[PDB]
Amino acid sequence: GYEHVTVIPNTVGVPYKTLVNRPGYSPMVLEMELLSVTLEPTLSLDYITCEYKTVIPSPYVKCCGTAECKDKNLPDYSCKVFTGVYPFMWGGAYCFCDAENTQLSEAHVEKSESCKTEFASAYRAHTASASAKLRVLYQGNNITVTAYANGDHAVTVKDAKFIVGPMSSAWTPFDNKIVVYKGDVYNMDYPPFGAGRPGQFGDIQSRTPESKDVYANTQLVLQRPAAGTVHVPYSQAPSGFKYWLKERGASLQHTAPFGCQIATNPVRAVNCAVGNMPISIDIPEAAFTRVVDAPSLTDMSCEVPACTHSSDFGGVAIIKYAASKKGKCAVHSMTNAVTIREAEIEVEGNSQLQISFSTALASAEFRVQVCSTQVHCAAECH
Amino acid sequence: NFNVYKATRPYLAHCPDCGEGHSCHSPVALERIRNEATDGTLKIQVSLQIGIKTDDSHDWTKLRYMDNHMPADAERAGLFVRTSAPCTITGTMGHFILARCPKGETLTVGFTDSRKISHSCTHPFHHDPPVIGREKFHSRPQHGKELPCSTYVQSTAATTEEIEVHMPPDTPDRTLMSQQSGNVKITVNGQTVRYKCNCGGSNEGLTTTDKVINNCKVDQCHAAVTNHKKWQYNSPLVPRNAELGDRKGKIHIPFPLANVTCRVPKARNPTVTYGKNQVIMLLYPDHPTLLSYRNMGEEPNYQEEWVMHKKEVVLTVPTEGLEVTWGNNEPYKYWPQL
Amino acid sequence: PVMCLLANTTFPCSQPPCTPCCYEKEPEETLRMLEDNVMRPGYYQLLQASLTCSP
Ligand SMILES: *[C@@H]1O[C@H](CO)[C@@H](O[C@H]2O[C@H](CO)[C@@H](O)[C@H](O)[C@H]2NC(C)=O)[C@H](O)[C@H]1NC(C)=O
Numbered sequence: 001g002y003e004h005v006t007v008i009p010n011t012v013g014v015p016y017k018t019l020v021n022r023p024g025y026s027p028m029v030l031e032m033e034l035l036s037v038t039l040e041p042t043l044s045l046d047y048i049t050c051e052y053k054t055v056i057p058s059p060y061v062k063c064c065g066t067a068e069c070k071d072k073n074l075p076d077y078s079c080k081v082f083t084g085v086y087p088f089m090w091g092g093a094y095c096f097c098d099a100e101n102t103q104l105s106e107a108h109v110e111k112s113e114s115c116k117t118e119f120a121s122a123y124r125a126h127t128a129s130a131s132a133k134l135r136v137l138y139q140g141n142n143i144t145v146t147a148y149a150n151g152d153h154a155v156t157v158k159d160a161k162f163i164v165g166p167m168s169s170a171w172t173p174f175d176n177k178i179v180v181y182k183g184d185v186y187n188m189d190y191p192p193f194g195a196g197r198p199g200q201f202g203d204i205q206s207r208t209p210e211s212k213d214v215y216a217n218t219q220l221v222l223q224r225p226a227a228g229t230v231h232v233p234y235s236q237a238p239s240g241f242k243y244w245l246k247e248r249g250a251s252l253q254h255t256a257p258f259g260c261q262i263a264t265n266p267v268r269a270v271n272c273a274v275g276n277m278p279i280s281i282d283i284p285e286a287a288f289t290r291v292v293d294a295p296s297l298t299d300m301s302c303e304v305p306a307c308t309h310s311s312d313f314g315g316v317a318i319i320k321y322a323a324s325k326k327g328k329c330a331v332h333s334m335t336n337a338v339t340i341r342e343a344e345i346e347v348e349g350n351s352q353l354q355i356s357f358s359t360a361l362a363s364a365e366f367r368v369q370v371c372s373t374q375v376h377c378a379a380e381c382h
Numbered sequence: 383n384f385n386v387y388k389a390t391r392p393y394l395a396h397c398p399d400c401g402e403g404h405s406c407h408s409p410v411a412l413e414r415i416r417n418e419a420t421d422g423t424l425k426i427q428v429s430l431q432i433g434i435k436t437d438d439s440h441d442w443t444k445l446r447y448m449d450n451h452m453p454a455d456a457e458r459a460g461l462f463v464r465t466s467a468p469c470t471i472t473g474t475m476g477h478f479i480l481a482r483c484p485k486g487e488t489l490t491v492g493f494t495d496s497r498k499i500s501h502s503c504t505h506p507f508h509h510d511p512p513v514i515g516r517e518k519f520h521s522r523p524q525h526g527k528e529l530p531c532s533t534y535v536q537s538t539a540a541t542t543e544e545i546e547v548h549m550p551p552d553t554p555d556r557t558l559m560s561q562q563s564g565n566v567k568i569t570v571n572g573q574t575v576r577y578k579c580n581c582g583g584s585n586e587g588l589t590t591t592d593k594v595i596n597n598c599k600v601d602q603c604h605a606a607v608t609n610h611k612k613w614q615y616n617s618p619l620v621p622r623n624a625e626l627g628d629r630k631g632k633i634h635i636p637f638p639l640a641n642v643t644c645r646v647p648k649a650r651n652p653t654v655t656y657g658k659n660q661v662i663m664l665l666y667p668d669h670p671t672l673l674s675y676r677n678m679g680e681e682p683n684y685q686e687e688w689v690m691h692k693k694e695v696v697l698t699v700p701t702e703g704l705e706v707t708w709g710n711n712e713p714y715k716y717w718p719q720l
Numbered sequence: 721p722v723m724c725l726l727a728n729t730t731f732p733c734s735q736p737p738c739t740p741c742c743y744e745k746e747p748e749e750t751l752r753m754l755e756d757n758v759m760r761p762g763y764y765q766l767l768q769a770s771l772t773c774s775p
């Protein structure tokens with residue numbers, strides 16, 4: 001029937017009061033509270049990174065001969081033949097010859113066994129999908145509405161059609177390029193695949209965690225073995241992933257502005273206090289009551305026995321009334337400086353009602369609308 | 383009743399420090415130290431085999447190491463792991479050891495043999511595991527916050543992870559050669575021996591029988607025992623077999639890495655006092671606790687400090703709001719009164 | 721099923737001709753056979769059968 005359009009700030013855990021005024025019908029008060037606001041960006045996995053493994057097999061010690069290095073199609077493949085080597089084992093010299101003996105040192109880089117368990121993912125973040133969970137005090141009961149904050153997603157709860165958004169701010173704590181490690185998200189302009197530097201994030205790059213082929217750039221250089229010693233000494237830049245793990249600093253959960261809460265699986269921005277949120281509620285005709293059909297309010301008076309000016313409902317007000325008939329009446333403050341806790345009260349006849357109110361003013365002058373009649377309240381808050 | 387240790391054997395490999403900074407052919411030589419586990423657990427690979435006897439039978443109280451030419455039995459009790467101070471061994475099977483170590487710059491793995499003689503191997507290894515959560519605690523609690531962490535599972539079973547194995551190289555041994563009377567006598571002793579002499583006639587093989595080299599000196603000859611019947615880890619500290627080409631084998635290994643849960647304690651909530659656009663907290667930590675804070679507006683201005691002992695903190699609460707995180711506890715949110 | 725190789729002949733990986741106690745009967749040729757089947761997908765089926773004894 002009647003469509004009520006209102007705008008509330010994008011702040012979670014704050015109840016807001018809205019007055020629905022349909023011409024020729026009794027006013028309606030609705031309490032709205034944002035339970036959660038989720039910003040889930042669309043992800044495109046470029047690659048994953050982890051600790052690398054330097055595979056070093058047994059060195060080929062060619063006694064009385066010269067070993068030869070072959071070009072192998074392996075990541076960071078290094079081969080070097082060392083001349084004039086006379087290696088010693090437990091029971092003396094390994095080679096019969098004193099002279100012409102050579103050692104072939106072999107090494108290559110591949111994915112570590114840890115890569116399936118310990119890894120960081122490089123994602124391309126673009127166009128965030130906004131969604132909201134809203135609590136509505138509708139007909140004396142709390143209703144939960146979960147809808148996309150785009151302004152083109154109608155969700156109907158208790159015959160009332162809800163259209164949330166579009167968001168005033170298109171702001172996201174995530175940049176175009178993001179890095180994800182377990183429960184932590186980082187804004188990082190990561191190097192592209194096949195462009196990773198040694199000792200830095202991306203020294204080893206794998207398109208998927210199950211991938212057989214990997215990119216490697218670790219500055220692996222094989223060194224000459226010690227006199228009479230069988231071993232493969234080498235110089236290599238330490239793990240870029242291991243270095244990043246200690247040098248990454250605080251994640252987006254701790255650094256993001258507007259008090260953003262960051263969650264993973266899927267990656268999302270929760271409760272980012274930025275901008276406002278328009279809310280459209282299509283209330284059906286049957287929910288509204290005509291002035292002839294609704295109770296009439298006369299001989300009204302208001303008294304404030306106790307008041308404290310604070311963030312919570314520190315004020316108490318007693319409103320005496322004379323009603324023509326029994327029925328439900330909406331309670332709303334006509335002054336923006338004062339907010340009333342209850343939205344609806346059951347009217348009887350020659351009885352009185354008690355309301356709870358919140359204000360910041362020491363001298364609170366406010367008007368209370370019970371059904372279609374207004375009553376002035378004078379309050380001295382401490 | 384399948385046993386992979388029938389084929390494999392413990393071995394002697396190069397170690398840079400066997401004690402007092404001197405290099406040796408160690409029966410407890412260090413191959414690879416893995417530190418991928420976020421919980422601080424180290425997966426250490428050694429040249430000997432734990433939990434297996436010389437007859438291949440599985441016995442948790444026993445250890446097998448290469449004694450000169452043939453493997454020998456040693457006690458599991460005598461096995462030790464240390465960095466700057468002794469480590470806590472969490473699991474042992476074959477060439478692998480699981481240990482929880484304190485902060486150090488070196489890693490030592492040792493044992494005691496049959497006739498005492500302590501054998502150890504020291505390698506330079508920077509060990510300083512990162513903190514799990516936001517509190518630097520000493521002992522692990524029963525109850526606490528469940529945070530994701532990785533470890534090497536204590537399970538005996540060998541699946542997923544693997545190592546490369548191959549036949550061992552020719553082991554040189556000068557005791558195989560003797561002089562009879564002024565010639566060279568090579569005693570095979572029921573083994574396949576490869577010999578080379580700087581004399582004429584016969585100087586080749588690869589012999590399964592005893593051989594004699596007339597008119598030759600003991601210094602002019604070289605003898606080595608070939609194995610071919612056993613397997614050994616593809617170690618970069620042991621030479622490759624010259625006779626065979628790129629012949630390789632592979633075996634499954636115990637203790638693979640997997641995601642688990644680490645219990646972390648939550649620091650007690652500080653006594654909170656409020657003021658005009660500011661919050662005052664009296665912090666009482668039992669151990670080092672991370673204290674972090676940020677503004678809930680356009681300029682968050684993130685600040686962090688590790689609280690060691692009793693400290694009073696005065697924080698300014700802006701109109702936009704202030705978020706404070708005290709250790710492993712959920713973040714506290716503060717707003718000024720309108 | 722899953723085939724393995726022995727010099728010039730093909731056989732199912734789980735059933736080498738040396739069974740039972742392949743390693744006990746002839747240790748050298750058992751390891752040589754295993755080395756020739758490392759690239760084969762049914763290598764671990766062959767490893768299990770070759771290193772199992774007690775009939
Ligand atoms: C350890 O945790 C990771 C997550 O941090 C697990 O994630 C994997 O899940 C899938 C199946 O194992 C695969 O698609 C990927 O390897 C990876 N994917 C994602 C999205 O995380 C992983 O299984 C865990 N590893 C073990 C050994 O338990």
Ligand SMILES: *[C@@H]1O[C@H](CO)[C@@H](O)[C@H](O)[C@H]1NC(C)=O
Nearest residue numbers: 015033135137140141142143
């Ligand atoms: C539900 O509505 C009641 C009034 O009947 C109110 O007290 C309460 O705060 C609402 N629920 C929540 C979770 O705020």
